[PDB]
Structures are given as C-alpha cells and as structure tokens.
C-alpha cells in the first residue's frame, strides 16, 4: 500500500536509501551512548530524562536498522536496476515506533519543566492519549497513499487536528512554567519547542509526498525529510533537553552536574 513497491530504483537511489537508513544507525546507537554517559552527572530528580533519550535512541535504531535489512532483502539489481522481490518493506514500522518514541520524548520535557504528582501524570496522559490519536489517524490515511489519495487527505486533517491541540497543550504548559526553571534555562527550554514545532512539520510533508511528488524520486525525498526530522526531534532534542537537566542540576546544588 505505500508508494515504495510501485517503482523501479536505480543503483544510485537504492544505495543512498540505505546510506540514509544505515548512518542513522550508527547516529542513534552513537548518541545511545552519550546519553548514557552523562547521565551520572544529571541529579536524580532529572536523571530520567536522559534515560528516557537513551531508550528513544535505541527505538529509533531498531527500526533503522530493521528498515535497512528490510530494504535490502525486498529489491535485487536485476538487469540495471533494482527491482521488488518480495514484500517486506513498509513505512508502517515508523508509526508503531513513534508510538513508543513520542510519550518517551514527551515525558522528558515535563520532567524538565518540573511539573510534578497530579499535574505531570494529567498532563501526560492527554498529550499521549493525543500523540497516539494523531498516530493512528495517521497510520490509517498512509494504508491509502497509493489507492486513495482523497482518504490519505481526510484522514491528514483528522490527525493534524490531534496534532494542533497536543501543541497547545504543550505550548500552553511550557511558556506558563519556564519561570520555574534554573540556570537561565526558562529561555533555552523556549528554543526547544521551536525546535519541536519544526522538527515535528517535517513528518506530515513526508506524508504527503505520495499526493505531490509520486515517483522514484519522491520516496528518496521522503527517507531524506525523514532522516531530517528524526535527527532533530530525536538526537539534538534529546541533546537540547539533556543541557536543559545538567543546567538545572548544577543550578540546584548536584556537586557532578557543577
Ligand atoms: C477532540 C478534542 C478534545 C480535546 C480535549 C482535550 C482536553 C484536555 C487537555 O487539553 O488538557 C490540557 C490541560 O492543560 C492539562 O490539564
Ligand atoms: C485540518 C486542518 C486544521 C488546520 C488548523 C490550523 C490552525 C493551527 C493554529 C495554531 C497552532 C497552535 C500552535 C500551538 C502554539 C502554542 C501557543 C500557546 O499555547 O498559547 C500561548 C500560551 O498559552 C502562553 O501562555
Ligand atoms: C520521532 C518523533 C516524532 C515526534 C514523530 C512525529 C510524527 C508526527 C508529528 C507525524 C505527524 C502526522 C501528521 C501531523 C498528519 C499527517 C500524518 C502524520 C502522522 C505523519
Ligand atoms: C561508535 C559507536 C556507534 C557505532 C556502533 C554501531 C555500528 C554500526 C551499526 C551498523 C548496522 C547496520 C546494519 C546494516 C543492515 C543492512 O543493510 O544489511
Ligand atoms: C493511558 C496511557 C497514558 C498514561 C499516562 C502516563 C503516565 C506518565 C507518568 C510517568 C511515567 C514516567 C515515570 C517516571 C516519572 C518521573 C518522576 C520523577 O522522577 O520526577
Ligand atoms: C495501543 C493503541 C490503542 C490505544 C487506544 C486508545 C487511544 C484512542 C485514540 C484515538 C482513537 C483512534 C481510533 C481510530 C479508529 C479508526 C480506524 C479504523 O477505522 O480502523
Ligand atoms: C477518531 C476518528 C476520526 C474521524 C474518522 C473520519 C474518517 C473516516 C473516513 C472513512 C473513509 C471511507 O470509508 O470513505
Ligand atoms: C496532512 C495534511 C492534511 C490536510 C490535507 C488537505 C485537505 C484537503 C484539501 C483538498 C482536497 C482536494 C481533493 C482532490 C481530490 C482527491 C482525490
Ligand atoms: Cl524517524
């Protein structure tokens, strides 16, 4: 049903979809590592923040990896070109990895912007409960990107609907509680959710390249808008957010932090 079974790709795309798919690999798994180390020098309060980073990283490297070896097992260079073999390989693996991912990077900026007891478990529930409506939505209207572009798009606008409140709440709780935060981190925490509200654009333009740009050409387009946006919302989020906790930290009296 996704567009990636319905062309032929020549050596030169192939082999740079899987450069894409494979250098995000070791990106996640390299990045795992870091968030790993400094986590010591993160005070207990905000220590899960960063472990939070760490599982990301690994959901995220995964699915790379599995969509990399999925890739290479469905074509085969047959007569100058790569063509499907067997069916293998669908972008569906991404949405049930966003599922797990997004509470997870979620959950790290409450922790962050420290809500806590009602609040933090109120406010998360509705902003997963909204995550994985737009999730899902989602994941209905791309099972029509090839057959019914007219259902990919209905099902587009139900799922920005969750997507447009779940920033507001977000937002909403984020420029309401910067105040609170130490260190000067009440204007970097600002940055990151520019930084989310970017980041996080990029996927429905993946979305919709089946409807604008249906070719060989689009599905490279596609992987590369959804290396940018991963790398973003993901790793330098995680970065961004685990500054935000050793700041904080230091500024509360954590001798490692500082
Ligand atoms: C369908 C729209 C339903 C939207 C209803 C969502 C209301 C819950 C909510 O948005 O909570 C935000 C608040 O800041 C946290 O307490
Ligand atoms: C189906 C297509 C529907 C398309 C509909 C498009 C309308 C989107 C408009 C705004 C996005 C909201 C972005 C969230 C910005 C958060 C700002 C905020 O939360 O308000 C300020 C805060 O309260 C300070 O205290
Ligand atoms: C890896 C981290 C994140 C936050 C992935 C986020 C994905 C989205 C925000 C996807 C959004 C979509 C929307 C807004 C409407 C079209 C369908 C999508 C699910 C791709
Ligand atoms: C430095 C620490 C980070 C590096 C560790 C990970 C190393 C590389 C992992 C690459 C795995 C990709 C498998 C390719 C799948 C395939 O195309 O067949
Ligand atoms: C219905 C599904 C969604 C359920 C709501 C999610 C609840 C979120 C609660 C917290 C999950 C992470 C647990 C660790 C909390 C950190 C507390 C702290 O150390 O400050
Ligand atoms: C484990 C994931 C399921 C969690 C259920 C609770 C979240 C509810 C979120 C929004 C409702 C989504 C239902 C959409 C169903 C329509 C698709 C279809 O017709 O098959
Ligand atoms: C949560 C559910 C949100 C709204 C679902 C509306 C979309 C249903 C479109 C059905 C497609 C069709 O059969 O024509
Ligand atoms: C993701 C973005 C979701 C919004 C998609 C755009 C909303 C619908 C716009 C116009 C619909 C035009 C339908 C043309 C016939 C399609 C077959
Ligand atoms: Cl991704």
Same mark, same amino acid.
């Given at each position: /049903?996704?567009?990636? $079974?319905?062309? !032929?790709? $020549? @050596?030169?795309?192939?082999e740079?979809? !899987?450069h ?5 690999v070791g990106?996640?798994?390299? *990045?795992? %590592?870091?968030?790993?180390? #400094? $986590?010591?020098?993160?005070?207990? /309060? ?27 097992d469905?074509?085969?260079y047959? !007569? ?5 073999? =067997? ?12 599922m ?5 990077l979620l &959950?790290?900026?409450?922790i962050?912007?420290?809500? /806590? ?5 109120? +406010? ?11 999730? %899902?939505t ?8 090839? =057959? ?6 209905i099902?587009? *606008? ?5 997507? #447009? ?14 105040? +609170?935060?130490?260190?000067g ?6 940055? #990151?959710?520019?930084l989310?509200?970017? *980041?996080? +654009? ?6 919709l ?6 070719? @060989? =050409?689009?599905? #490279? ?5 959804? +290396?940018?946006a !991963?790398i $973003? ?5 995680? &970065?961004?957010?685990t ?16």
């Open positions: /049903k996704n567009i990636e $079974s319905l062309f !032929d790709y $020549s @050596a030169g795309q192939f740079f979809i !899987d894409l798919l494979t250098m995000g990106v996640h798994f390299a *990045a795992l %590592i870091f968030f790993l180390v #400094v $986590s010591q020098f993160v005070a207990p /309060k905000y220590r899960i923040a960063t472990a939070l980073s760490c599982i990301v990283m690994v959901s995220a490297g995964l699915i790379l990896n599995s969509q990399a070896v999925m890739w290479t469905a074509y085969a047959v !007569d100058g070109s790569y063509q499907l073999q =067997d069916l293998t390989f669908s972008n569906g693996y991404r949405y049930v990895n966003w797990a991912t997004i509470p997870c &959950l790290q900026l409450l962050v912007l420290n809500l /806590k007891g009602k609040e933090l478990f109120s +406010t998360a529930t509705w902003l997963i409960l909204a995550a994985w409506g737009m999730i %899902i989602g994941y209905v209207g791309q099972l029509y990107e090839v =057959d019914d572009i007219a259902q990919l798009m099902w587009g *606008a139900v799922s920005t609907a969750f997507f #447009v409140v779940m920033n507001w709440i977000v937002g909403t709780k984020i420029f309401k509680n910067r105040a +609170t935060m130490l260190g981190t009440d204007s970097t925490i600002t940055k #990151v959710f520019w989310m509200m970017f *980041a996080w +654009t990029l996927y429905p333009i993946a979305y390249v089946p409807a604008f740009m249906n070719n @060989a =050409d689009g599905v #490279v387009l596609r992987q590369l808008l959804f +290396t940018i !991963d $973003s919302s993901k790793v330098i989020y995680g &970065l961004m957010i500054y935000i906790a050793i700041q904080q930290s230091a500024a509360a009296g954590y001798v490692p932090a500082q």
